[PDB]
């Protein structure tokens, strides 16, 4: 797959469409789209291990972490593959998403096809919060909206 | 992946949860779960090519057909990889799904993870209806409910 897509749904209505593109295997993945119904400010943004929404976003389980590393920010060498940091919502509650990541992939050992994308209640503290929970979930709290990451045309 | 899952939702009353298991690499896939809100009788049941629900079930595109074959039933050599045939609803509108298929896979070029499972308005004619449409879609009509196939625990 060179292209992938995700429909985000949860209460508010928090809702958005996120697009993925990878021109080359072993190339970066571009992530882009729009999310509405958010509180003004930063919201944690992660790929979760399971593409399971049977009981809502809680069924997605933990951050996608195939190398068993600690939680980090996207720029950190010590991170989960799933750690995409934060997106920022404006005064109207709209986040405009524009990310390039070298660790996620749309094929191979780091593939995110069939996993869950989640947008969170609070900001991700990128493992710099000096509680034990910081280097696990980054203290980003509840799951506002989620969807499964599918193969796109 | 040895396990996968799909939540079926639509614009009407049809909803359900479908599970997938594959014990051995290139071995058979078991498909099981329950679908409710159906008219009594047979409903077309297929994997479509794209895991894209941006505009509901129509965004999933055509049947998953990597080998460039004609539409058939699951028991035919001449089929799409995504041709899983029909499920049957009782008088209460519930279909109990139980399928073993050796053409679909949870890895490789037959891999269905990141694609869309669809339950249809009408019965699939399995390429036997003697119109040009029969050997493309099986004349199963509109898409009542769908979802993206995700990696499960
Ligand atoms: Cu998360
Ligand atoms: Cu179909
Ligand atoms: Zn993490
Ligand atoms: Zn077909």
Author numbering:
A (entry chain B), B (entry chain A): 1 to 153
The publication says:
As a control, as-isolated SOD1 structure was also determined under a similar low-dose conditions to 1.77 Å resolution. Resolution of the as-isolated structure is a little less as a smaller crystal was used for this purpose. The high-resolution structure of the complex gives clear evidence for the binding of the compound at Cys111 while the as-isolated structure shows a number of water molecules. Waters are indicated as small red spheres, Cu and Zn molecules are represented by cyan and orange spheres, respectively.
A shared effect of these mutations is that SOD1, which is normally a stable dimer, dissociates into toxic monomers that seed toxic aggregates. A common property of ALS-associated SOD1 mutations is that they increase the propensity of the dissociation of the SOD1 dimer, which promotes misfolding and aggregation of the resulting monomers into cytotoxic species.
